[PDB]
Amino acid sequence: EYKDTLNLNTTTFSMKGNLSVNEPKTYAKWQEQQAFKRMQARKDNHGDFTLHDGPPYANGHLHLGHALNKILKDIVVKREYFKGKKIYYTPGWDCHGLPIEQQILERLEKEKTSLENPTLFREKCRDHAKKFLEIQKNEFLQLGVLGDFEDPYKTMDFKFEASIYRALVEVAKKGLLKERHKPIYWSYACESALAEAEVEYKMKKSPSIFVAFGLKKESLEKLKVKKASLVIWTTTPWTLYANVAIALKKDAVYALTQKGYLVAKALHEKLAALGVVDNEITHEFNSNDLEYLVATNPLNQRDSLVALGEHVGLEDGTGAVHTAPGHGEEDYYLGLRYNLEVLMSVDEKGCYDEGIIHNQLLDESYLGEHVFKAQKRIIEQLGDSLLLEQEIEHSYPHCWRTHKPVIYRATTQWFILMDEPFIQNDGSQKTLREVALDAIEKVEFVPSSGKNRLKTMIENRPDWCLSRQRKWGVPLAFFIDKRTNKPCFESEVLEHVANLFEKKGCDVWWEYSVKDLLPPSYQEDAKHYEKIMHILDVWFDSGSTFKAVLEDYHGEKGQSPSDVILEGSDQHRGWFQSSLLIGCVLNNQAPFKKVITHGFIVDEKGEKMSKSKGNVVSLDKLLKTHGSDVVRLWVAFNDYQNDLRVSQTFFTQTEQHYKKFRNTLKFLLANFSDMDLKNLERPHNFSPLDHFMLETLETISAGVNSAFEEHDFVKGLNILMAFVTNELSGIYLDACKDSLYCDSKNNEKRQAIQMVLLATASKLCYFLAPILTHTIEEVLEHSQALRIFLQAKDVFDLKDISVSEKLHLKEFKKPENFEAVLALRSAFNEELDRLKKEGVIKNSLECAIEVKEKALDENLVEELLMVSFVGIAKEKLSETPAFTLFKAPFYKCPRCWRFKSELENTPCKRCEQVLKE
Ligand SMILES: CC[C@H](C)[C@H](N)C(=O)OP(=O)(O)OC[C@H]1O[C@@H](n2cnc3c(N)ncnc32)[C@H](O)[C@@H]1O
Ligand SMILES: [Zn+2]
User: Residue 790: inside a domain, yes or no?
Assistant: First the structure.
């Protein structure tokens, strides 16, 4: 009957998050109130921070990977904002290319329709990108992220298309944009060249065959043998029609078997065990003496030159390599080395064309057949020359959006050259590969291992094929002079076109005549010029975002180079590399100072998610079930630099952490809710325990901050959680509960406790604000004391505070040392544990302790162990080397339940006083 005489100590801040209901209201408010613009306009901004957004493709709804990405960017940006900086973060969308165009192509199929008008086709692509840009923008905002989402950048904006073109212009004028004719990746499904970032290597089954090419009569006579046939190994019977040579290893021994097969001696043992060749060797020859002999192709009876390759391998195959210059890059260079024909009779759709008849390379029945469908019939046609057929599996390149296997076709395309010296901005001379490698060494990678991934790619990469044979993209908008057969790179022409794109967009390249695309100076010679109609690799679009966004807006959307970029691990093959290369051409450095890489969302078994496999976890369902602040906490509280597995068990762990933080903030708010805000002006006498908590708060705050500075949010959250769980809840709040609930509101020691709780909630708000922004906004909404103490209207006014200044602490105050008393506490609690299960007592408050160590502050002992008496009493309960435990020789107080009453059912002296107030 004393419960209503206690301090109420409640807050309107609720235990339950109600996140599905409350979070949309917060995020809608931030949109309506233009919170991001308010952040940028903050009057006392000091220093600048630029995160340059890498642009997601404007196709589809968001998945959990996009959420991971944008949430990490948001934590990084909000950290810098709350450190006091002016922030720049303009999100963007990647609107061109097959990620958009393939969806139009597939829908036209399903509807059984076609769209051949270029302007109308580009319009359907553009409308699709516009549609999903808005969908994605709103789904991003539902995660609580803040950026310039009402003014995002778009690669389909006319000014951006011009910026991309002007970047290409800079490459051309530095001498790095050149035509090459060679075999390259070819996607037959979309009738386009491809480069590396547009291929996905996947396991594929293939025929694997060993084929005898008999030496011609005159070559047998020169070699002085009766029978000899070189054996080749190939997995592509579809290229045998284009054979012109058989390449051997230089200065290497070739064995001739009794049945007359000629293979590398080093491989004969393996080949005979396979049954490709017979076991007996009759003669050995040096490949140097075999060069310029001639064999016969069993498929079509054509000559095949015996040639010497560069670096022919002896781990695979036979040591004799079927050479088809039209369908292999190294083959092509060998063919030119020996002035051989480049046979290439495979069209843009991957089908054999009339060249096989004109050149007598393959039977006419194959005309129009797809090369992969023809292979079975080709293999059957080989007859006795087929020595062995297997089926193998190997990693094979596939088109990134049609998912069909690619082939290689000799073709003329446009490239950025990697090993071509060009004039540096400082006047020196270096190749792009050299510049990029030097640039990488100036970039910080998080984790540092990511440097090695990008560096190895730059060390090994080939020339970058830029030209694509689709319509949705930025054209390589140069004219060829027919009088010279070379491109026109005159600045007046290039600037004229760039200005037209900036005002009208690239549709004009298809619509306008050559004369109408030329400056008036040139229009009389318009008859001599023809347009290049190829469009740029979409990876060149996105590689140019630093120029189009950071440079062309002169710092208004962030500096070049950016301070941070942050993307998934596939962007070393992608956007990190394209942006590095273009930045090194234009600026001779990377357009970013730091690269943070995150892993991929994968299922509970570590496997990739796909609608095909049935293992896709829905972002919308995840948000509905847990709320965005829980999804955000899951991101921050996990090892995001490696792949992240999604499962109910891991989200249940995160929910328990969120509940612990939330329940802690509720308790804090409840227990300084009644404090007279005049307290905030005056200093207080703090107890040793108070000081221990303030000093501990400062030590853990430094550790959290250092961890968050290194982007190790797990480490920082673990420090914060341990403080919340152990020192705060376990030690301080337990020890303070009596004063908080049972001491007078005027009690100066209670007021000091409340100031410690205020300072503690203040630091929790500051450190959690980048991660749980909605929840900290809610905390401030419900606590007038915090808003006054922090001079904060809302979460966007938070700053790191000096607890020392706010609480008026003395400069040279010597820290508490609690090692001895906390060791006594743990030892007492272990002994109390044992007495409880024996039934000897129920609670620490029933006990008296006499400590043999006279050196300890006895009131601190009583405070920390929550005994009701320090000293000697009558009934001995137990004894250790450090202390003796007795039953407290008092009654339980009916108001505070401490054993401090001299009379049964009578308020103790403290409570008596409080009740009389
Ligand atoms: C930087 C984007 C470039 C230019 C390109 N448009 C692109 O890849 O766009 P998108 O495919 O939509 O991806 C945009 C960003 O999401 C990241 N991402 C994609 N899938 C996943 C996934 N399962 N798990 C985690 N992250 C993912 C990707 O790593 C990039 O950080
Ligand atoms: Zn009492």
Answer: yes
> Which domain, by its residues, includes 912?
819-916
Q: Are 794 and 867 members of one domain? A: no
Q: Are residues 317 and 220 in the same domain?
A: yes
User: In angstroms, what is the span from residue 911 Cα to ligand 2's centroid?
Assistant: 4
Do 753 and 861 reside in the same domain of the chain? no
What atom in ligand 1 is closest to the CA of residue 542?
4
Tokens of 611: 């609608």
From residue 401, give the alpha-carbon distance in Å to each of 109, 356, 520, 841: 15, 30, 42, 72
Does residue 689 lie in a domain region?
yes
For ligand 1, pick from 536, 567, 601, 640 the residue to mutate: most ligand atoms within 8 Å of CB.
567
Regarding whether 786 and 877 lie in a shared domain, the answer is no
Residue 851 has which token pair?
């400590």
Q: Among the three residues 409, 424, 451, which one is the final residue of a domain in this structure? A: 409
Q: Which atom of ligand 1 is nearest to the CA of 59?
A: 12
Q: At what angle do helices 19-32 and 619-626 cross, to 10 degrees?
A: 110
CA distance 669 to 765: 12
| Rounded Cα gap, residues 145 and 149, in angstroms | 9
Q: Which of 61, 63, 71, 94 to mutate to test the pocket of ligand 1 (most atoms within 8 A of CB)?
A: 94
- Residue ending a domain, among 782, 806, 830, is 806
Task: For residue 67, tell me if it sits in a domain.
Answer: no
Burial class (CB in 10 A: 0-12, 13-18, 19+), 451: middle
Which residues are near ligand 2, the ion (C-beta closer than 5 Å)?
893, 895-896, 908, 911
End-to-end CA distance of the chain: 18
Residues 380 and 402 in one domain: yes
Atom 10 of ligand 1, residue of closest alpha carbon = 56
Q: What is the CATH number of the domain that holds 742?
A: 1.10.730.10
List residues bridging with 230 in a β-sheet. 213, 262
Residue (of 198, 201, 200) closest to 541 by Cα position: 198
The H or E element that residue 464 is part of is strand 464-465
Q: Is residue 569 exposed (0-12), middle (13-18) or buried (19+ Cβ within 10 Å)?
A: middle
Distance 569 CA to ligand 1 centre (A): 9
Render the burial of 78-100: b for 16+ CB within 10 Å, e for the rest: bbbbbbebbbbbbbbbbbbbbbb
